């Protein structure tokens, strides 16, 4: 799945994110923890305070993974193989949380790319994140 | 729900919201982002394209109405259930809108507040707003439970 | 919820259910079918395989307790909220289980009743039961709203 | 994303359905309509009465589609391409409904194959139906 127009949308959009990718990844997590406190339960041994260097640190990891996904839109399963294992098998992350993080990410981008965040870009980004989430929750073995 | 501090925060911010602008944008993005929702507005006219949807006059007019109700709930944060009783009846009993869709619109509204206010739409403020929308979707799905 | 008609049907059917057996089967299947739920029961021991889960003594015992809680609700079909008040606080406040999950368990119970009663578990009876399980799921997620 | 054990379980289970797939398909629709009344809004040009010949007819169609999907587990997007276009683009069915029908099918199968419907089979069938549902709501940003 994920159509050309979409892919093209994901590309320029993420293209615009450029080098803020890690600060956005961090802010996204921060917005997730604050809006949906149930999510904090997955990071018990993490300093979840505003400005935390752990969250800062994790934001970067998330961004890099999304970036890798952007560049492998035809091989998302291939590109995120490692991560589904971790999130599904090891962590046992409830699938609902993927939706919370995706929403928190959409809020963040919109927040930073008002001119670029058009209904169509918004629709493609939604589709994208949903595909990613689908991949990460694929291996509940 | 909203703590006294949370209501103060939400209430203070809301004053800067232009309901005409924000309402039309939110309804339009819902229709664009979650297509199945168009099923409910077939009479609004052309919804064929993103542009079709965003420039539709009925879409825009309807958005304002939706936002007005929001504003009203903002005035009665303690009794959204009562405040939305009539709308709950309309949406559930008459339209038969899956309650899951009330949540999608609430979420699109948050996205649209963020797009419009940038830096002022802080993680803290977003968090207070998530409570509001959850509160509203809940009052709307009343007659479902 | 249910009319007196439905309440009667539901109640009579309930009399035939072996809560011990049905309770263990229902919790076991939740853990097997929706694996992420295993996260909440780490202390139950070995849940590595479907056979492991289903023969786990702590699962069987917990399972019975869950169904007992259902039977109690069955007795108070008009005040579900009150009947699951403390249970709501435990699951939402202490455990932090996403309310979507209360829905999953409700659905799993229906499947188990279907597996166990066959032809007796008619579409109509099933429909009444969907109402009950939805009611129970609502009463539990109440500390969230 | 079905595993070796899953594919086997699905094929084995479906093999037990055998020549009753059409009847099970009909029963599944009927349980959906009764339990989740909001689903009937998709069939206004249908006689939804108990024992309606139209429902029994439509049931057979649903069953044949699943029968095909069971032998294209490796290429669901492929075996149901046309169906995705119908549901998604033409009827624009709300994704929540797929879960309601999937639920109705599991209830139906459990009812008819008590001894065959083991927790492992249930889990596999569940994953199968969720995969099919993803395909049918594919396009659908
Ligand atoms: C957009 C979807 C997501 C992506 C791309 C993503 C990405 C990542 C990455 C890249 C890692 C680190 C792996 C490593 O290099 O060691 C990670 C770890 C982790 N993720 Fe996610 N994640 C996502 C969603 C979630 C969600 C929704 C949750 C739970 C609410 C979650 C919880 C965790 C946890 C607990 C860890 C391990 C943290 C640690 O102890 O170091 N993730 N994730
Ligand atoms: C936050 C959630 C929502 C709120 C507050 C809301 C509010 C409203 C209001 C104020 C009206 C008009 C009532 C009047 O004329 O005074 C309305 C009508 C309507 N709503 Fe909603 N709505 C919500 C969600 C939805 C959703 C999710 C859908 C379906 C996708 C929907 C579909 C409709 C339709 C079809 C109408 C009537 C169309 C017409 O008669 O022109 N609404 N809603
Ligand atoms: C309709 C849905 C449910 C009902 C009626 C229900 C009922 C109960 C009852 C009666 C207890 C006894 C408390 C104790 O003595 O520890 C309990 C405990 C518990 N429930 Fe549930 N439950 C439901 C759903 C869930 C779900 C979906 C989960 C997680 C995915 C969950 C997780 C737990 C846990 C972890 C415990 C306590 C374990 C322990 O302390 O030994 N419950 N529940
Ligand atoms: C397991 C998931 C599903 C499968 C395998 C499936 C399969 C099918 C098939 C094989 C057809 C016949 C297409 C033709 O005319 O050649 C069909 C049509 C249709 N389906 Fe589904 N379907 C599924 C889910 C749903 C859901 C959840 C709904 C809505 C509640 C739905 C509503 C319809 C409608 C309205 C039609 C067209 C009927 C007509 O006009 O003849 N389907 N589906």
XYZ file of C-alpha atoms and ligand atoms in Angstrom:
744
model
C 0.000 0.000 0.000
C 0.892 3.637 0.583
C 0.376 5.385 -2.748
C 2.758 7.507 -4.770
C 1.021 10.819 -4.007
C 1.212 9.853 -0.340
C 4.875 8.844 -0.556
C 5.580 12.120 -2.308
C 3.738 13.932 0.479
C 5.633 12.025 3.178
C 8.907 12.865 1.435
C 8.611 16.647 1.137
C 6.970 16.871 4.556
C 9.764 14.919 6.232
C 12.054 16.842 3.883
C 10.915 20.075 5.548
C 11.358 18.583 9.039
C 14.945 18.403 7.954
C 17.296 18.621 10.897
C 14.681 19.304 13.563
C 13.648 15.686 13.403
C 15.111 14.830 16.807
C 13.690 17.848 18.652
C 10.277 16.981 17.184
C 10.642 13.333 18.157
C 11.395 14.543 21.707
C 8.486 17.011 21.813
C 6.144 14.374 20.448
C 7.046 11.998 23.301
C 6.655 14.845 25.773
C 3.201 15.691 24.406
C 2.305 11.965 24.604
C 3.355 11.540 28.259
C 1.409 14.639 29.347
C -1.807 14.000 27.355
C -1.930 10.228 27.862
C -0.364 9.357 31.235
C -1.106 5.643 30.852
C 1.821 5.692 28.377
C 4.365 6.598 31.063
C 4.036 3.085 32.441
C 6.299 1.805 29.658
C 9.192 4.016 30.831
C 9.396 3.424 34.587
C 13.145 3.805 34.772
C 13.242 7.024 32.785
C 13.359 10.645 34.022
C 10.105 11.881 32.457
C 10.540 15.491 33.583
C 10.447 18.347 31.049
C 13.931 18.824 29.633
C 14.880 15.263 30.557
C 17.971 14.141 28.643
C 16.561 10.614 28.433
C 13.435 11.766 26.564
C 15.666 14.075 24.551
C 17.742 11.031 23.851
C 14.784 8.804 22.977
C 13.281 11.460 20.691
C 16.393 11.173 18.564
C 16.027 7.390 18.318
C 12.388 7.649 17.265
C 13.179 10.320 14.641
C 16.010 8.266 13.123
C 13.664 5.286 12.837
C 10.966 7.369 11.158
C 13.613 8.750 8.827
C 14.677 5.211 7.921
C 11.011 4.466 7.270
C 10.667 7.474 4.991
C 13.565 6.222 2.849
C 12.115 2.694 2.724
C 8.418 3.369 2.070
C 8.243 0.245 -0.109
C 9.963 -1.898 2.513
C 8.521 -0.710 5.815
C 8.355 -4.259 7.185
C 11.960 -4.695 6.025
C 13.064 -1.348 7.457
C 11.312 -1.750 10.827
C 11.767 -5.505 11.336
C 13.970 -5.089 14.405
C 11.574 -2.712 16.087
C 8.362 -4.788 15.776
C 10.201 -7.571 17.565
C 11.076 -5.193 20.385
C 7.746 -3.392 20.686
C 5.466 -6.391 20.192
C 7.399 -9.350 21.552
C 9.596 -7.838 24.227
C 7.799 -4.713 25.433
C 4.226 -5.911 24.848
C 3.141 -2.353 24.010
C -0.693 -2.144 23.811
C -1.608 -1.285 20.211
C -3.677 1.765 21.284
C -0.490 3.612 22.305
C 0.738 3.645 18.709
C -2.290 5.773 17.886
C -1.523 8.125 20.775
C 2.042 8.634 19.649
C 0.975 9.155 16.013
C -1.513 11.808 17.122
C 1.135 13.471 19.299
C 3.466 13.482 16.294
C 0.797 15.033 14.011
C 0.215 17.771 16.619
C 3.955 18.509 16.733
C 4.502 18.791 12.972
C 1.349 20.878 12.494
C 2.701 23.054 15.278
C 5.998 23.539 13.454
C 4.961 23.452 9.783
C 1.745 25.445 9.633
C 2.256 26.461 5.989
C 3.344 22.962 4.985
C 0.763 21.044 7.041
C -2.043 20.943 4.465
C -5.084 18.665 4.563
C -3.490 16.408 1.938
C -0.073 16.288 3.688
C -2.045 15.688 6.907
C -3.913 12.815 5.260
C -0.724 11.218 3.897
C 1.179 11.583 7.208
C -1.743 9.941 9.001
C -1.665 7.063 6.525
C 2.117 6.760 6.927
C 2.158 6.631 10.718
C -0.678 4.072 10.576
C 1.386 1.837 8.298
C 4.379 2.108 10.608
C 2.202 1.271 13.599
C 0.759 -1.671 11.705
C 4.304 -2.961 11.150
C 5.383 -2.466 14.787
C 2.392 -4.401 16.183
C 2.626 -7.205 13.634
C 4.579 -9.708 15.735
C 2.737 -10.360 18.997
C 3.840 -14.026 19.031
C -12.302 16.099 34.669
C -10.657 19.511 34.388
C -9.059 20.712 37.604
C -9.693 24.367 38.517
C -6.252 25.056 37.185
C -6.966 23.172 33.935
C -10.242 25.004 33.318
C -8.579 28.384 33.903
C -5.919 27.500 31.368
C -8.386 26.278 28.723
C -10.834 29.117 29.298
C -8.155 31.797 29.035
C -6.806 30.356 25.778
C -10.169 29.691 24.123
C -10.833 33.430 24.024
C -8.316 33.780 21.175
C -9.999 31.149 18.998
C -11.865 32.377 15.908
C -14.639 29.758 15.686
C -15.453 30.486 12.037
C -11.888 29.856 10.891
C -11.050 26.886 13.165
C -14.462 25.209 12.789
C -14.450 25.063 8.995
C -10.857 23.854 8.964
C -11.530 21.021 11.417
C -14.684 19.679 9.764
C -12.925 19.814 6.391
C -9.821 17.933 7.600
C -12.048 15.259 9.145
C -13.707 14.689 5.751
C -10.330 14.743 4.022
C -8.381 12.599 6.537
C -11.200 10.174 7.467
C -13.135 9.618 4.212
C -15.849 7.302 5.505
C -17.167 10.405 7.289
C -18.298 11.950 3.986
C -21.077 9.341 4.016
C -22.809 11.566 6.571
C -22.616 14.819 4.566
C -23.588 13.637 1.063
C -25.975 16.576 0.732
C -23.193 19.125 1.308
C -22.323 18.836 -2.333
C -18.950 18.304 -3.898
C -16.520 16.525 -1.595
C -14.709 14.867 -4.486
C -11.314 16.416 -3.690
C -9.359 17.914 -0.808
C -9.841 21.301 -2.440
C -13.478 20.456 -3.100
C -13.887 19.688 0.595
C -11.943 22.646 2.021
C -13.750 25.234 -0.129
C -17.255 23.793 0.232
C -19.464 26.558 1.646
C -21.723 24.147 3.497
C -18.666 22.474 5.019
C -17.447 25.852 6.232
C -20.874 26.894 7.533
C -21.319 23.612 9.342
C -17.849 23.908 10.948
C -18.910 27.187 12.617
C -21.973 25.472 14.064
C -19.839 22.636 15.431
C -17.448 25.125 17.031
C -20.297 27.166 18.543
C -21.415 24.029 20.405
C -17.806 23.544 21.523
C -17.769 27.089 22.858
C -20.987 26.338 24.669
C -19.497 23.234 26.312
C -16.517 25.402 27.281
C -19.002 27.431 29.330
C -20.354 24.304 31.065
C -17.267 22.136 31.606
C -18.940 20.710 34.697
C -22.013 19.417 32.875
C -21.143 18.515 29.294
C -23.498 15.542 29.531
C -26.531 17.809 30.027
C -25.198 20.428 27.595
C -24.815 17.881 24.770
C -27.925 15.789 25.555
C -29.829 17.119 22.536
C -26.811 16.676 20.208
C -26.229 13.190 21.616
C -29.810 12.399 20.650
C -29.287 13.736 17.133
C -25.989 11.939 16.441
C -26.740 8.600 18.070
C -30.462 8.003 17.749
C -30.936 9.759 14.384
C -27.619 9.809 12.522
C -26.179 6.658 14.100
C -22.605 8.012 14.097
C -20.161 5.504 15.602
C -18.897 7.146 18.781
C -15.376 6.488 17.515
C -15.910 9.378 15.106
C -16.595 11.908 17.906
C -13.038 11.153 19.090
C -11.579 11.609 15.573
C -13.081 15.094 15.269
C -11.880 16.065 18.780
C -8.392 14.941 17.726
C -8.543 16.862 14.423
C -9.578 19.991 16.350
C -6.475 19.656 18.581
C -4.307 19.327 15.445
C -5.960 22.419 13.961
C -5.476 24.393 17.217
C -1.811 23.455 17.075
C -1.471 24.502 13.399
C -3.024 27.829 14.133
C -1.342 28.743 17.441
C 2.099 27.253 17.049
C 4.245 27.813 20.132
C 1.297 29.008 22.256
C -0.302 25.563 21.943
C 2.017 24.056 24.546
C 2.200 20.403 25.554
C 0.493 21.452 28.777
C -2.291 23.281 26.941
C -2.679 20.424 24.470
C -3.034 18.111 27.452
C -5.872 20.194 28.938
C -7.518 20.242 25.505
C -7.297 16.453 25.210
C -9.394 16.240 28.383
C -11.983 18.621 26.912
C -12.367 16.669 23.675
C -12.536 13.361 25.530
C -15.178 14.950 27.765
C -17.138 16.108 24.709
C -16.920 12.821 22.785
C -18.137 11.115 25.951
C -21.151 13.429 26.410
C -22.052 12.869 22.750
C -21.922 9.086 23.077
C -24.238 9.298 26.153
C -27.335 7.762 24.582
C -25.091 4.961 23.263
C -24.391 3.724 26.791
C -30.307 -1.263 28.993
C -32.438 -4.394 28.778
C -36.206 -4.466 29.037
C -37.679 -6.823 31.655
C -37.992 -9.258 28.750
C -34.282 -9.305 28.019
C -33.309 -9.247 31.677
C -35.310 -12.446 32.127
C -33.766 -14.206 29.148
C -30.249 -13.187 30.164
C -30.717 -14.193 33.786
C -32.143 -17.635 33.007
C -29.306 -18.368 30.586
C -26.777 -17.221 33.183
C -28.007 -19.966 35.543
C -26.516 -22.623 33.263
C -22.975 -21.174 33.176
C -20.165 -22.781 35.163
C -18.214 -19.668 36.172
C -15.095 -21.596 37.172
C -14.664 -23.220 33.798
C -16.014 -20.373 31.679
C -14.029 -17.840 33.726
C -10.711 -19.619 33.256
C -11.330 -20.170 29.535
C -12.222 -16.510 28.973
C -9.171 -14.997 30.726
C -6.897 -17.646 29.169
C -8.176 -16.767 25.657
C -7.738 -13.024 26.280
C -4.057 -13.614 27.156
C -3.558 -15.877 24.134
C -5.479 -13.845 21.510
C -4.313 -10.354 22.618
C -0.741 -10.952 23.869
C 0.012 -7.448 25.108
C -2.390 -8.171 27.977
C 0.138 -10.649 29.363
C 2.000 -7.556 30.545
C -0.453 -7.132 33.441
C -0.071 -10.678 34.715
C 3.697 -11.213 34.783
C 3.438 -12.707 38.279
C 1.072 -15.473 37.163
C 4.046 -17.491 35.967
C 4.488 -19.161 32.593
C 2.341 -17.720 29.821
C 4.843 -18.626 27.093
C 2.438 -20.766 25.060
C -1.277 -21.195 24.461
C -1.112 -24.499 26.374
C 0.920 -22.792 29.120
C -1.689 -20.061 29.586
C -4.685 -22.408 29.495
C -3.259 -24.814 32.129
C -1.881 -22.038 34.372
C -3.485 -22.428 37.804
C -3.364 -18.709 38.656
C -5.132 -17.914 35.369
C -7.885 -20.435 36.108
C -8.334 -18.955 39.597
C -8.258 -15.345 38.496
C -10.661 -16.286 35.719
C -13.186 -17.501 38.281
C -12.939 -14.220 40.183
C -13.631 -12.192 37.034
C -16.772 -14.205 36.219
C -17.940 -13.962 39.833
C -17.758 -10.195 39.325
C -19.864 -10.628 36.170
C -22.502 -12.684 38.005
C -22.746 -9.868 40.571
C -23.311 -7.301 37.807
C -25.976 -9.628 36.375
C -27.797 -9.164 39.671
C -27.531 -5.356 39.380
C -28.182 -4.687 35.676
C -29.546 -1.216 36.452
C -26.644 -0.031 38.635
C -23.541 -1.393 36.936
C -21.598 1.745 37.825
C -22.121 1.239 41.541
C -21.393 -2.502 41.268
C -17.913 -1.936 39.761
C -16.904 1.256 41.555
C -13.882 -0.077 43.467
C -12.999 -2.377 40.565
C -12.949 0.714 38.331
C -10.494 2.455 40.627
C -8.215 -0.573 40.672
C -8.134 -1.093 36.894
C -7.887 2.572 35.889
C -6.075 4.304 38.764
C -3.756 1.548 39.967
C -3.324 -0.795 37.005
C -3.800 1.737 34.208
C -5.336 -0.791 31.771
C -6.517 0.953 28.579
C -10.330 0.794 28.533
C -10.254 -0.684 25.045
C -9.162 -3.900 26.781
C -12.320 -4.146 28.908
C -14.094 -4.372 25.536
C -11.832 -7.214 24.342
C -12.515 -9.280 27.451
C -16.260 -8.672 27.026
C -16.046 -9.929 23.423
C -13.942 -12.947 24.446
C -16.618 -13.898 26.994
C -19.257 -13.908 24.206
C -17.106 -16.240 22.064
C -16.610 -18.588 25.017
C -20.387 -18.638 25.716
C -20.878 -19.443 22.025
C -18.283 -22.250 22.139
C -19.860 -23.633 25.291
C -23.602 -23.336 24.435
C -23.716 -23.870 20.700
C -27.118 -23.591 19.062
C -28.586 -22.461 22.390
C -26.587 -19.223 22.160
C -28.858 -17.592 19.600
C -28.243 -14.340 17.782
C -30.945 -12.757 19.927
C -29.462 -13.977 23.210
C -26.037 -12.903 21.951
C -27.455 -9.440 21.254
C -28.663 -9.061 24.868
C -25.268 -10.238 26.080
C -23.487 -7.659 23.893
C -25.521 -5.054 25.787
C -24.458 -6.478 29.149
C -20.739 -6.785 28.324
C -20.768 -3.231 26.959
C -22.394 -2.053 30.184
C -19.744 -3.754 32.307
C -16.925 -2.317 30.153
C -18.456 1.161 30.632
C -18.780 0.854 34.417
C -15.075 -0.193 34.623
C -13.672 2.603 32.436
C -15.672 5.145 34.404
C -12.689 6.399 36.440
C -11.286 7.524 33.061
C -14.096 9.722 31.716
C 1.873 -10.945 8.618
C 0.807 -14.489 9.350
C 3.288 -16.989 10.736
C 3.747 -20.615 9.759
C 1.654 -21.738 12.731
C -1.027 -19.172 11.895
C -1.351 -20.137 8.233
C -1.692 -23.798 9.232
C -4.312 -23.006 11.886
C -6.370 -20.906 9.426
C -6.183 -23.516 6.672
C -7.024 -26.267 9.166
C -9.961 -24.371 10.639
C -11.368 -23.346 7.256
C -11.046 -26.983 6.226
C -13.386 -27.820 9.124
C -15.893 -25.159 7.995
C -15.955 -27.066 4.728
C -19.220 -26.882 2.833
C -20.899 -24.843 5.579
C -19.020 -21.643 4.824
C -22.025 -20.051 3.055
C -24.359 -20.847 5.951
C -21.813 -19.630 8.493
C -21.356 -16.474 6.378
C -25.098 -15.795 6.470
C -25.334 -16.449 10.212
C -22.406 -14.075 10.790
C -24.149 -11.215 8.936
C -27.371 -11.803 10.890
C -25.557 -11.771 14.262
C -23.871 -8.505 13.205
C -27.173 -6.800 12.298
C -28.850 -7.884 15.561
C -25.913 -7.057 17.832
C -24.618 -3.934 16.071
C -27.691 -2.302 14.564
C -25.704 0.651 13.207
C -24.278 -1.762 10.620
C -27.637 -2.120 8.833
C -27.226 1.418 7.474
C -25.004 -0.054 4.783
C -27.739 -2.315 3.381
C -30.825 -0.126 2.874
C -31.612 -1.811 -0.441
C -31.716 -5.135 1.284
C -34.439 -7.138 2.997
C -32.721 -7.671 6.386
C -35.552 -9.769 7.843
C -34.778 -13.025 9.646
C -34.204 -15.713 7.022
C -34.063 -13.100 4.233
C -32.829 -14.731 1.009
C -30.757 -11.663 0.274
C -28.774 -12.067 3.498
C -28.257 -15.782 2.856
C -27.146 -14.800 -0.636
C -24.750 -12.135 0.596
C -23.453 -14.594 3.236
C -22.373 -17.001 0.500
C -20.496 -14.171 -1.190
C -18.613 -13.243 1.996
C -17.745 -16.923 2.525
C -16.433 -17.390 -1.042
C -14.207 -14.321 -0.560
C -12.735 -15.736 2.683
C -12.261 -19.096 0.972
C -10.166 -17.360 -1.645
C -8.247 -15.346 0.943
C -7.341 -18.576 2.793
C -5.302 -19.615 -0.250
C -3.664 -16.276 -0.855
C -2.386 -15.621 2.701
C 0.853 -14.478 1.088
C -0.901 -11.953 -1.178
C -4.077 -10.683 0.415
C -3.688 -7.246 -1.228
C -3.651 -9.267 -4.437
C -6.548 -11.689 -3.933
C -8.892 -8.956 -2.631
C -7.775 -5.941 -4.673
C -11.245 -5.485 -6.184
C -12.963 -5.844 -2.791
C -10.753 -3.149 -1.247
C -11.860 -0.770 -3.992
C -15.539 -1.538 -3.317
C -15.557 -1.266 0.479
C -13.048 1.517 0.827
C -13.593 3.776 -2.191
C -17.160 3.017 -3.281
C -19.023 2.208 -0.079
C -16.476 3.916 2.191
C -17.318 1.564 5.056
C -16.246 2.754 8.527
C -13.242 0.691 9.655
C -14.907 0.017 13.010
C -17.447 -2.211 11.222
C -14.819 -4.741 10.148
C -14.199 -5.519 13.801
C -17.926 -6.046 14.342
C -18.158 -8.477 11.446
C -14.943 -10.243 12.471
C -16.406 -10.637 15.960
C -19.638 -12.052 14.522
C -17.715 -14.628 12.481
C -15.647 -15.813 15.473
C -18.861 -16.151 17.496
C -20.353 -18.127 14.617
C -17.364 -20.451 14.197
C -17.049 -21.017 17.969
C -20.713 -21.978 17.962
C -20.308 -24.579 15.206
C -16.771 -25.967 15.808
C -16.509 -26.152 19.600
C -13.839 -28.841 19.608
C -11.949 -27.284 16.715
C -12.053 -23.727 18.034
C -9.073 -23.885 20.413
C -7.352 -20.823 21.874
C -4.560 -21.218 19.277
C -7.060 -21.419 16.410
C -9.043 -18.493 17.813
C -5.853 -16.414 17.919
C -4.922 -17.350 14.341
C -8.409 -16.731 12.937
C -8.399 -13.402 14.732
C -5.120 -12.372 13.129
C -6.401 -13.616 9.744
C -9.593 -11.535 9.895
C -7.645 -8.455 11.027
C -5.338 -8.895 8.011
C -8.292 -9.198 5.634
C -9.886 -6.128 7.243
C -6.679 -4.143 6.740
C -6.697 -4.968 3.067
C -10.344 -3.928 2.669
C -9.663 -0.510 4.241
C -6.286 -0.130 2.511
C -6.552 2.853 0.131
C -8.604 4.647 2.771
C -6.019 7.142 4.111
C 5.817 5.672 15.936
C 6.009 4.477 16.503
C 7.312 4.163 17.277
C 8.572 4.180 16.837
C 9.114 4.535 15.441
C 9.432 3.808 17.950
C 10.806 3.731 17.897
C 11.594 3.235 18.913
C 13.033 3.084 18.840
C 13.853 3.496 17.601
C 13.438 2.567 20.002
C 14.855 2.219 20.492
C 15.483 0.910 20.061
C 16.980 0.860 20.304
O 17.681 1.420 19.420
O 17.370 0.319 21.364
C 12.275 2.382 20.843
C 12.284 1.863 22.122
C 11.213 1.866 22.987
N 9.913 2.210 22.644
Fe 9.270 2.806 20.835
N 8.655 3.550 19.067
C 7.340 3.766 18.674
C 6.253 3.620 19.515
C 6.270 3.319 20.860
C 5.142 3.359 21.761
C 3.733 3.760 21.280
C 5.570 3.019 22.982
C 4.802 2.871 24.304
C 3.931 3.756 24.761
C 6.987 2.735 22.865
C 7.805 2.330 23.909
C 9.157 2.087 23.803
C 10.012 1.648 24.887
C 9.507 1.395 26.324
C 11.242 1.502 24.381
C 12.540 1.089 25.120
C 13.112 2.233 25.985
C 14.339 1.848 26.772
O 14.123 1.257 27.866
O 15.452 2.152 26.271
N 7.400 2.929 21.564
N 11.153 2.794 20.149
C -17.145 16.885 18.764
C -18.015 16.125 18.095
C -19.216 16.782 17.369
C -19.923 17.868 17.709
C -19.724 18.811 18.912
C -20.949 18.034 16.700
C -21.878 19.059 16.651
C -22.914 19.188 15.745
C -23.847 20.289 15.666
C -23.818 21.541 16.570
C -24.695 20.011 14.673
C -25.882 20.866 14.173
C -27.052 21.040 15.146
C -27.851 22.311 14.919
O -28.322 22.458 13.760
O -27.963 23.106 15.886
C -24.330 18.734 14.108
C -24.955 18.065 13.062
C -24.488 16.973 12.347
N -23.359 16.248 12.694
Fe -22.136 16.627 14.258
N -20.846 17.026 15.752
C -19.788 16.232 16.149
C -19.346 15.104 15.487
C -19.874 14.562 14.340
C -19.357 13.418 13.613
C -18.112 12.629 14.047
C -20.167 13.209 12.570
C -20.109 12.136 11.464
C -19.002 11.985 10.737
C -21.214 14.210 12.613
C -22.235 14.305 11.685
C -23.232 15.257 11.731
C -24.300 15.378 10.761
C -24.467 14.431 9.556
C -25.058 16.408 11.144
C -26.331 16.976 10.486
C -26.245 17.442 9.033
C -27.335 18.411 8.629
O -28.496 18.136 9.039
O -26.980 19.405 7.944
N -21.015 15.043 13.701
N -23.223 18.230 14.782
C -14.844 -6.644 31.922
C -13.559 -6.601 32.197
C -12.946 -6.977 33.562
C -13.470 -7.331 34.733
C -14.942 -7.512 35.142
C -12.376 -7.545 35.665
C -12.487 -7.951 36.996
C -11.451 -8.109 37.904
C -11.551 -8.570 39.272
C -12.883 -9.001 39.938
C -10.333 -8.532 39.808
C -9.870 -8.938 41.228
C -8.787 -8.098 41.900
C -7.735 -8.779 42.733
O -8.140 -9.444 43.734
O -6.517 -8.644 42.410
C -9.427 -8.055 38.788
C -8.065 -7.889 38.931
C -7.167 -7.626 37.925
N -7.501 -7.272 36.637
Fe -9.335 -7.334 35.827
N -11.180 -7.314 35.022
C -11.498 -6.965 33.727
C -10.613 -6.656 32.724
C -9.250 -6.628 32.857
C -8.311 -6.444 31.766
C -8.762 -6.313 30.296
C -7.084 -6.453 32.283
C -5.716 -6.309 31.590
C -5.505 -6.414 30.288
C -7.232 -6.626 33.719
C -6.199 -6.700 34.639
C -6.310 -7.079 35.967
C -5.209 -7.320 36.870
C -3.726 -7.194 36.448
C -5.723 -7.662 38.049
C -5.020 -7.991 39.371
C -4.047 -9.148 39.496
C -3.668 -9.417 40.945
O -3.617 -8.391 41.675
O -3.492 -10.613 41.276
N -8.564 -6.754 34.051
N -10.125 -7.814 37.615
C -14.454 -9.893 6.417
C -14.763 -8.684 5.913
C -15.618 -8.572 4.626
C -15.600 -9.328 3.531
C -14.725 -10.560 3.207
C -16.585 -8.799 2.606
C -16.883 -9.330 1.373
C -17.816 -8.832 0.490
C -18.155 -9.419 -0.788
C -17.523 -10.718 -1.344
C -19.073 -8.637 -1.343
C -19.771 -8.801 -2.723
C -19.175 -7.923 -3.821
C -19.732 -8.098 -5.209
O -20.815 -7.501 -5.454
O -19.058 -8.805 -6.004
C -19.343 -7.539 -0.446
C -20.217 -6.500 -0.668
C -20.658 -5.600 0.270
N -20.186 -5.523 1.570
Fe -18.673 -6.573 2.366
N -17.199 -7.707 3.172
C -16.619 -7.540 4.419
C -16.959 -6.555 5.315
C -18.003 -5.674 5.200
C -18.463 -4.761 6.217
C -17.812 -4.675 7.613
C -19.512 -4.080 5.714
C -20.392 -2.970 6.330
C -20.921 -3.114 7.545
C -19.727 -4.547 4.363
C -20.701 -4.095 3.491
C -20.895 -4.505 2.179
C -21.840 -3.946 1.232
C -22.797 -2.790 1.596
C -21.692 -4.608 0.084
C -22.451 -4.435 -1.252
C -23.786 -5.175 -1.349
C -24.497 -5.049 -2.679
O -24.775 -3.879 -3.030
O -24.741 -6.120 -3.305
N -18.793 -5.532 4.068
N -18.562 -7.682 0.679
